[PDB]
Structure formats: C-alpha cells, structure tokens
C-alpha cells in the first residue's frame, strides 16, 4: 500500500522498494549460481542438472526465434528469465508483512516504475545498437522503400514497443500484489489455499512469456 520510496537520498529521490528488492534478488540469484558452479562434475548432478535444464530451455527458446547469432544475447535473455522467475517466486513466498518499514513497504523489484522501465530501456538500447550493427549506420529499420507513409510510424513503434512490454510486466506483477495483499487482508489465510496454485502457475508462465517476448524483440532487432 506504500509503494513510492523512502528518503534515502543519493543525489536524487530514489525508490526504496526498487533498491532493496532488486539488490537482494540479484544477490540471492548470484549466490545460488556461484556457489554451485564451483565444483561441477561432467555428469549433471544435483543442482547442475537444474541449472543446465534452465540453460537448455534458454538455448531452445533462443535458437527457435532470433536468427544465426542469438548466442551472445543468450546471457541477456537468460539473466532476464532468471530474474523474473526468482522475483515472482519471492513475491509469492518470501515474507514481507511481518517485517515493517517506517516510511514505506518492500515487496518486489517490479512493483515500482524503475525496475521495469529499466528493463524496457536496456532492451531498447540493445535493439537500437543491434539494428545499427546488423544493418547500416545511415538509416536503421526506419527507412521506407515500399510505402510513403510508414516513415514516422516506424520510429513511433520502435518507441512504443519497449514501454508496451514494460506495461505488460506492470499489469502482471501489480495485479499479483493486489491479489496477495487483499487475499491475506480478507481474514486468516484459509482462503488463499486454491488461489496460491493459480498465482504460482501465472508467475511461472509470466517468466516464460517475458523470456520469449525478449527473444522475439531481439529477433526484430536482427530483422
């Protein structure tokens, strides 16, 4: 219910949920990835099997969509998959109503503006750079050979697509926060029992659809 910020000034007014949630989720993700890659065997053992299953999932969803050179963007789209996956599970699970904050709240990284618009902005910078790379440096995909009208709408869609994906992530995670907060504010938690399954299913497939939607748009960057 308190989603704005708290006054931890650092040169500009910065959001507190953004900072702490994204920092701790990146920290636990790298703590999971780093300690289990120290001593891996050639056989897919206990955690290495799970990590390699995730990575071959990313290999398939990156091989089917983009083009001939998806492998350097597999790190980007894979860290994006892992981020959305663990942040959705942490929003569904990790307790943040018993801990109280004097100025605001602390639920998830995508609840606020910054860590969804940052994903949109990084993807858009990647699309413009990859378009100036794979295509020439005079005119990127904007240039209109067949139709004499599509010239402004080309840059207009190249502007309105990242914000659209941002709004997708918004309308998912903010809706999920509303579900969980009003559903635990109803009464003692005998009611969330069937709804938790639907939330888990939607969160997992939310991670998957964000992954394939990043893949599709670096595919358009390739095109």
């Amino acid at each position: 219910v308190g989603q704005h910020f708290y006054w931890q000034i650092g040169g500009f007014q910065i959001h507190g949920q953004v900072l702490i949630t994204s920092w701790v989720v990146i920290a636990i993700l790298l703590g999971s990835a780093a300690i289990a890659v120290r001593s891996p065997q050639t056989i897919p053992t206990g955690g290495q099997n799970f990590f390699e299953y995730v990575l071959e999932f990313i290999r398939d969803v990156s091989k089917t969509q983009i083009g001939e050179e998806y492998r350097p963007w597999v790190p980007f789209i894979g860290t994006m998959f892992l981020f959305i996956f663990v942040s959705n599970w942490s929003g569904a699970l990790l307790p943040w109503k018993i801990i109280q904050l004097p100025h605001g709240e602390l639920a998830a990284p995508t609840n606020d503006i910054n860590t969804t618009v940052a994903l949109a902005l990084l993807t858009s910078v990647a699309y413009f750079y990859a378009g100036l790379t794979k295509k020439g440096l005079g005119y990127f995909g904007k240039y209109i050979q067949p139709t004499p009208i599509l010239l402004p709408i080309n840059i207009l869609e190249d502007f309105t697509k990242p914000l659209s994906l941002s709004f997708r992530l918004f309308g998912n995670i903010l809706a999920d926060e509303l579900v969980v907060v009003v559903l635990v504010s109803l009464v003692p938690l005998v009611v969330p029992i069937p709804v938790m399954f639907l939330g888990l299913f939607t969160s997992g497939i939310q991670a998957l659809i964000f992954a394939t939607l990043a893949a599709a748009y670096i595919g358009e960057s390739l095109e």
């Binding site: 780093a34 891996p40 980007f76 990084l122």
Partner: peptide, 21 residues
C-alpha cells in the same frame, strides 16, 4: 541507475562464471 549497473554487472559476471562451463 545503480540498479541498471548492478543488473549489468550480475549478467556479465554470471555469464562468465556460469554459462560456458
């Protein structure tokens, strides 16, 4: 801002330590 920088550092580092192995 620093969230973007931390995401970039996480992705480069995790790539190097985690993907090719």
């Amino acid at each position: 801002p620093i969230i973007m920088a931390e995401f970039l550092f996480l992705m480069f580092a995790l790539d190097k330590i985690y993907y090719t192995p």
